[PDB]
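Consider the following assembly input.
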Amino acid sequence: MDFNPSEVASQVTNYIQAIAAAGVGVLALAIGLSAAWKYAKRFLKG
Amino acid sequence: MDFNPSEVASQVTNYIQAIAAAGVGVLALAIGLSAAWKYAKRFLKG
Amino acid sequence: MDFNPSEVASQVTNYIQAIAAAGVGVLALAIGLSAAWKYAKRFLKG
Amino acid sequence: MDFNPSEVASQVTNYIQAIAAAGVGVLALAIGLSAAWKYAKRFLKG
Amino acid sequence: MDFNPSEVASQVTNYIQAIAAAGVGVLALAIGLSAAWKYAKRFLKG
Amino acid sequence: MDFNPSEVASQVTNYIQAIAAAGVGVLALAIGLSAAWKYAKRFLKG
Amino acid sequence: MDFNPSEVASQVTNYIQAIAAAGVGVLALAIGLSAAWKYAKRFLKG
Amino acid sequence: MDFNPSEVASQVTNYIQAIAAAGVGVLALAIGLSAAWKYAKRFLKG
Amino acid sequence: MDFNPSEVASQVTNYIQAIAAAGVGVLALAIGLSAAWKYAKRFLKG
Amino acid sequence: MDFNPSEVASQVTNYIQAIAAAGVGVLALAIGLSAAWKYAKRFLKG
Amino acid sequence: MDFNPSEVASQVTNYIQAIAAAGVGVLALAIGLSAAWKYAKRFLKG
Amino acid sequence: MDFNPSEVASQVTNYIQAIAAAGVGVLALAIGLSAAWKYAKRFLKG
Amino acid sequence: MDFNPSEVASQVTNYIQAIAAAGVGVLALAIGLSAAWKYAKRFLKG
Amino acid sequence: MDFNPSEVASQVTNYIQAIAAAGVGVLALAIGLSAAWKYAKRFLKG
Amino acid sequence: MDFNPSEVASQVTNYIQAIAAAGVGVLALAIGLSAAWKYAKRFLKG
Amino acid sequence: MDFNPSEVASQVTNYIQAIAAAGVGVLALAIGLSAAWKYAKRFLKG
Amino acid sequence: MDFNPSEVASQVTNYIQAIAAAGVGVLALAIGLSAAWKYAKRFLKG
Amino acid sequence: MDFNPSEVASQVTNYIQAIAAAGVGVLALAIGLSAAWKYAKRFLKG
Amino acid sequence: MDFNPSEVASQVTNYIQAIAAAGVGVLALAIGLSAAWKYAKRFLKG
Amino acid sequence: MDFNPSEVASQVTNYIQAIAAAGVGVLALAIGLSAAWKYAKRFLKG
Amino acid sequence: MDFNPSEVASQVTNYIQAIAAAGVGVLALAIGLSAAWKYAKRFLKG
Amino acid sequence: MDFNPSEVASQVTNYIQAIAAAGVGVLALAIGLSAAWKYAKRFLKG
Amino acid sequence: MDFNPSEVASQVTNYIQAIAAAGVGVLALAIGLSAAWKYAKRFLKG
Amino acid sequence: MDFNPSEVASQVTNYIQAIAAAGVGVLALAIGLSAAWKYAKRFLKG
Amino acid sequence: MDFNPSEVASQVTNYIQAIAAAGVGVLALAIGLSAAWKYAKRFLKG
Amino acid sequence: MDFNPSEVASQVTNYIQAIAAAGVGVLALAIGLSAAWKYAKRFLKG
Amino acid sequence: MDFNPSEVASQVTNYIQAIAAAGVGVLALAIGLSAAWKYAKRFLKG
Amino acid sequence: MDFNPSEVASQVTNYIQAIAAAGVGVLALAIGLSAAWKYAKRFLKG
Amino acid sequence: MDFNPSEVASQVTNYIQAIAAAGVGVLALAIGLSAAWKYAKRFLKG
Amino acid sequence: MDFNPSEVASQVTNYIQAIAAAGVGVLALAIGLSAAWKYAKRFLKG
Amino acid sequence: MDFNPSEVASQVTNYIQAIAAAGVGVLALAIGLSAAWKYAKRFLKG
Amino acid sequence: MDFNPSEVASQVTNYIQAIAAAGVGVLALAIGLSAAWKYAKRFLKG
Amino acid sequence: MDFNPSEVASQVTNYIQAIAAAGVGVLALAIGLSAAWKYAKRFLKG
Amino acid sequence: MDFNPSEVASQVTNYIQAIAAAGVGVLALAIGLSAAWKYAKRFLKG
Amino acid sequence: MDFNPSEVASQVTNYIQAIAAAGVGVLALAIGLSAAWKYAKRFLKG
């Protein structure tokens, strides 16, 4: 009732905000890791 | 008789008003809680 | 005898009329109250 | 009786209106979040 | 006795008629509400 | 004494006959009413 | 008693008939919607 | 006394016989109705 | 009771018959669609 | 009392016997239906 | 006095004997009746 | 008085003994019935 | 009852219409994104 | 009570025995089917 | 009174003991059954 | 007068003593009986 | 009168004390029983 | 129950038989298609 | 029920028709693009 | 009544606070665990 | 007569006042208790 | 006559005072007793 | 009356305190158990 | 009451202990099984 | 079911027929293009 | 309870033992099959 | 269960036997085809 | 409902815009890197 | 309640610790295995 | 739905147009580079 | 739990040990096979 | 909630740091290995 | 598992044995063929 | 979200910078090595 | 986790060490083999 179902809105949304930026810190490292042998092998052929 | 069965109306209705807002404070926390691992696992797949 | 057992009819029937409308004011609030978490949780799954 | 069961109609329906729009604010963020690594990993393969 | 137990028939039956149509106004909104995240998430996977 | 206690038999039994059929008119409507949201919600899941 | 419990049969059954066809109008749209990105992504791989 | 409590037996039992067959006409329709979206969605996944 | 639970059998089974053939009309088109770029790209390599 | 509670045993048990075989006629068709696109899509990948 | 209060014993006890067996004929039918939709719905879920 | 309230003990207890075993004959069939589609659908997924 | 279960039909169906077109705006961008390195790497080999 | 809950054991367990062997007849065919194009395409590359 | 409410304790508890072991005989078979196609399909992918 | 109203005390109290223990023999059996299907159905769900 | 209505207090209260502990012996077994298939099925999914 | 879970066996298995042969008609054409430029280019080098 | 599951058929199938032709417009350009350096390098060797 | 339904609010909400943080300690470990072979295999391809 | 039927009013009403607040102390604990496993299991799925 | 009908007042009223407090000692135990399995079963579901 | 309805408060509330902590000992084990195959299978994919 | 709700604790917890170790014996075999073709196919490519 | 999985056969196979002949038009030109400098340089050496 | 959850252990584990060895018979043939053209083409180049 | 997972073994393995010999018929022709210009050009140099 | 599912549209789409341009910065460097030895070795042959 | 939901934390987390290190022992062997033919074939080309 | 899957068409196709012309700028330089020593060495022999 | 997730470790790891050595027996033969014409043609040029 | 989803960040990221450097130790050796015959054969031609 | 991955070893290795000797029959003829004009032209110069 | 997908940009790009210059150090040596016998043999002919 | 991803490092790296030296034993023989006719023909011209 009234201005109370706003907390689901406020409490939860915010739960991910630090959390997503938190996820991505992980792919920077996840992209490069395959990216890492891409790098060793990119150098081999010539 | 007369203006007396109004108290069932007045006494009771009011019993929930603080009480509902009181319930919902609990789902804010209940929505996010599954919401919480949704959050840890949302980050894993990529 | 005669036109006297009409009061049971008149006195009593009327006792509920304000009283029923009085009851229902209570379910509006009673329907929504479960209705209330139906509402917080309706939002969670997706 | 009469024009009284209208409140279940009026009181409750309205309970979700701010509440749904309230839910969705959460998926905008929920869609993108997987959407987020979709994004880091979308970039890796080439 | 006679044509008097007809009111239980007349008085009551009618009590729901505005009332049911009144209920359903609530599911239109209840169907769509899960229906609502079905909608946000339906869009995510591809 | 004799053929007189037959009226309890005749007067009363008959009191319900219009009355039962009268009751049931009410469940047709009572069965469907839950039956009514069964109907809105039956449609949601798929 | 007699030909009266037929209304539960008549009143109710009919409640869904417009209602089911009514449900399905919703999946036509529900099937295609995932069906929709199936469609955008079906096109990507080659 | 004697052969008179047989009517409870005869009058009542029979009350359901048209009535049950009457109920079931309703599930044929009730089974299929979920059965109905089972049907729209059964078709989606592949 | 008796020959009445046959309708669940008759009413429902039939619900899919036009419906399945109806599904498949969709894969003919779904198989070929990936099948479609399989086709453009099948041609590229040589 | 005595040999009378046997009918609950006899009357009811039998109610399902045609009825179960009746259910299953429905899954033959229910298994294959997903089974149906399993079939269209099983063919696509190679 | 003497062997006379035996009739309360003899006259009455016997009043139910056909009567109980008479009652139960009614539950055979009463057990199955819920038992009846238990049966239609038992079949739906899978 | 004395050894007479033993019949409530003897007459009644015994009423269920054939009756319970009688009930259970019904669940053997009730367990398997859901058990029945559990069985058709258990087979589908792989 | 009557012309009331039409809202589930009207209220909900419409919920996706802006919403689907809304989804697809996202794949235009999702198709091209892999499409994007397809593009950088398409250029490398010769 | 006693040796009666054995039927749940006897009646049901047996329900699957023909039924499982029945399922598997379906994978022999399900394994090979992907197995089928695995087979056409296994032959292409050299 | 005294040592008599012990039978609820003795009579009932024991009712399940053969009965539980009886249930489980059913999952051995229930675990493996999905377990069964897990088994046919476990073999396919390589 | 004197030591005579003691018999109401002595004669009656004792009337139940065998009688209560006599009642309970009946619930041992009454508790388990629902307890009995609790038992068949307790086993179904998993 | 005086110290006599104490027996209702003394006689009765005590009736449950062995009796409750007696009840619970039954749930230990009642909790685990669903608990039992929870256990067989808990093991299946992975 | 009995000879009824055979239809899952009969109805479904047969669903693929025309269907597999149907798939393969597609690889004859799928094998050759790469096979097709293999063919134009096989001719170039000498 | 009846002529209603036809929309899944009509609504959806049509969703791809402009969409596939839409995909292919993309490979014309995708085939040639590798095709493009095939073209620069095809010219180098002699 | 009054300031008493506050405990549902106070007693319960707090139940999860140590508990959620408690859950998440588990995903840190749950994310990495798939994350763990992602890690062994991320290293293989080049 | 006069100001004496006020005690039913005064004596009794007051009987619950400490008593209700007394009841609720019990649900704080009753809400959370299911609330308690809601809490252990809320944490499992992700 | 005079100050003598006061004893009905004095003698009797007092009869319950130890007696009510005496009753309630019994519900403390009566509330909890259902309360007791509420407690065993409250713990099962999660 | 007075300070006596406090026992419902004192006697009962306390009934769960050892009991809840008692429940949870069970989920520690219930969380991990699915958690257990999550663990065997978490290890498989890479 | 007292030291009795401990059995739910003692009786049940222990139910899984042999049971979990029992589950895992199954994944050792479940991990390797895909693991098995991983093994045949791991060997093919070079 | 029946003569419906024929469209995957009919719809798709045909998709390539104009398409392959379409591919080859491209190698006529692709064979000659290296073929083209083969031609300029074939002439140089003598 | 006791030595009964051992069958999940005994019944199931064994289900794969003939089954795995059964899978592998298939890769011997699956390894060689690509292995087969590896073989025809291994011979071409010199 | 038992001698049933043998069909995956029997049905499938056999699927390739005519099929492999079928593949190779294609390389005889594939080896020689390059082999064909190897042949025209083998003759040129001297 | 209304203008709220627009955020999935607004929030997400934008997530990639800096992100794609971000990807490509990586291929500039990825194209040249093979491009790099292409460059050292391009120089060797003459 | 209090310091009890800590076991989910303590009992479970620890379940993987020996278990992960346990997984990885498997990739050391899984990395090298493809790694193994990488090794035989790495040696062939020169 | 409608005129929305056109963006995949519009957004993406255009992504390469500047991009291809962009690729080729690279071969002009790639053709000549071998072309470059072709040029130094073309001059040596006479 | 405890020393049980060791079997995934023990059962599986060992699955490859005979299996890898088994793979390599195949490359000895795979290395030499190209190695074989390397050998016939190594001899031709002088 | 709060500073707890940081562990996914802290626990996991770190999992690769020793692990990547660990991967690369493998390419140093992987680059040179082809690099190894590049080396034996680099020496042959002159 | 056990002595089963030996067939990959036995089935496949043997596939080439007739096959290699089969290849070489082709170079005897391939060596001499250039060898053939080497032979006509070897004779010309003097 | 926001300024976080920049790390994929920052973390990775930089991974090659020392790495490319690192590759090329290898061709200086790779160019000259053939370059090396080019050098011994360049000197022979005159 | 911790000191466990070191085995990929230890187990694998070592796999080639005997293996590379093993490769080269093959070129000593591969260099000389062309080297062999270089040798017969080196002697012819003068």
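Chains X and AB do not touch (no CB pair under 8 Å). Ask yourself how this observation constrains the way the partners meet.
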